[PDB]
Amino acid sequence: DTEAPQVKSGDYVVYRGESFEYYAEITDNSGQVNRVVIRNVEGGANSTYLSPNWVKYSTENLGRPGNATVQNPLRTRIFGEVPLNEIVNEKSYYTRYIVAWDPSGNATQMVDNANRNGLERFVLTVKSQNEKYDPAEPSVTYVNNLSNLSTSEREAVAAAVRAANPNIPPTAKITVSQNGTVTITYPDKSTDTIPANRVVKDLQI
Ligand SMILES: CO[C@@H]1O[C@H](CO)[C@H](O)[C@H](O[C@]2(C(=O)O)C[C@H](O)[C@@H](NC(C)=O)[C@H]([C@H](O)[C@H](O)CO)O2)[C@H]1O
Ligand SMILES: [Ca+2]
Ligand code: NA
């Protein structure tokens, strides 16, 4: 319904142990939107049920003339904190709908089709925490023997990786094995690994 408010959302990827914040933009031909609900598909016209319960949202400047124009769309904040105990797999996404109402009571229609994703329909994808980070591997630590790093050398590699990766969670644990393999264990206990060849060299040859 192009006489109902129109919504532009996005690909709302979120990560265990991390806060998220996205904005959707809403316009209406009347220039005004009075109400915005984000909801699961189930329930019928009056439902506001939305899960997971940690998905929050808010819309400032509701119910004012000109609050929802093409040149200055209404914005809805979609935010929350993803718990560490969320299940993560290829199916750990949640398809949700943004419904907005204009002064005539026309509400954005919910159409159950993936071609509407990024409009009034959006997918909230929950990923493990390691997926938020792409550890930098540009550091180089020279060790005596690549097949047998000492404790000091293992700590040196971990410190080099940390120094190259100020953005990874401070409480993520960087450990290095006896052959220089790096494991980054995130707060949600997911891991990234860095092969030794990318962080360690020796002068044995
Ligand atoms: C009516 O059936 C639902 O229709 C919606 C679209 O309107 C979805 O297709 C939904 O399926 C999913 C989804 O929300 O995309 C498929 C996901 O794999 C499920 N996630 C998990 C972690 O199992 C969700 C989830 O079960 C649901 O969103 C709970 O509110 O459902 C259809 O079930
Ligand atoms: Ca309208
Ligand atoms: Na990663």
3-class SS letters over the chain: CCCCCEEECCEEEEECCCEEEEEEEEECCCCCCCEEEEECCCCCCCCCCCCCCCCEEEECCCCCCCCCECCECEEEEEEEECCCCCCCCCCCEEEEEEEEECCCCCECCCCCCHHHECCCEEEEEEECHHHHCCCCCCCCEEECCCCCCCHHHHHHHHHHHHHHCCCCCCCCEEEECCCCCEEEECCCCCEEEECHHHCEEECCC
Q: Which atom of ligand 1 is nearest to the CA of 91?
A: 18
Q: Which ligand is nearest to the CA of 100?
A: 2
In the reported structure, the alpha carbon of residue 92 is separated from the centroid of ligand 1 by a whole-number distance in angstroms of 9
Inter-CA distances, 125 with 52, 103, 147, Å: 12, 33, 40
Peptide bond into 73 cis (omega under 30): no
Q: Which atom of ligand 1 is nearest to the CA of 110?
A: 7
Is 151 domain-assigned?
A: yes
Residue range(s) defining the domain that contains residue 32: 6-127
- Is residue 40 domain-shared with residue 72, that is, in the same domain? yes
In the reported structure, the alpha carbon of residue 68 is separated from the centroid of ligand 2 by a whole-number distance in angstroms of 10
Mutate to test the pocket of ligand 1, among 82, 92, 95, 110 (most ligand atoms within 8 A of CB): 95
**60, 93, 127: which is the final residue of a domain?**
127
The CATH number covering residue 41 comes to 2.60.40.4140
Is 95 domain-assigned?
A: yes
**127, 153, 170: which is the final residue of a domain?**
127
In the reported structure, the alpha carbon of residue 31 is separated from the centroid of ligand 2 by a whole-number distance in angstroms of 8
- Is residue 138 domain-shared with residue 44, that is, in the same domain? no
What burial class does residue 4 get, using C-beta atoms within 10 Å of its C-beta: 0-12 exposed, 13-18 middle, 19+ buried? buried
- Is residue 101 domain-shared with residue 153, that is, in the same domain? no
**103, 127, 151: which is the final residue of a domain?**
127
For the record, the structure tokens of 1 come out as: 């319904």
- Is residue 16 domain-shared with residue 99, that is, in the same domain? yes
In the reported structure, the alpha carbon of residue 123 is separated from the centroid of ligand 2 by a whole-number distance in angstroms of 25
Is 71 domain-assigned?
A: yes
Q: How far is Cα 26 from Cα 23, in angstroms, rounded to an integer?
A: 10
Is 187 domain-assigned?
A: yes
Q: What is the number of structural domains in the chain?
A: 2
- Is residue 122 domain-shared with residue 142, that is, in the same domain? no
- Is residue 47 domain-shared with residue 15, that is, in the same domain? yes
Whose alpha carbon is nearest atom 3 of ligand 1? Answer: 41
Is 54 domain-assigned?
A: yes
- Is residue 143 domain-shared with residue 104, that is, in the same domain? no
Whose alpha carbon is nearest atom 10 of ligand 1? Answer: 95
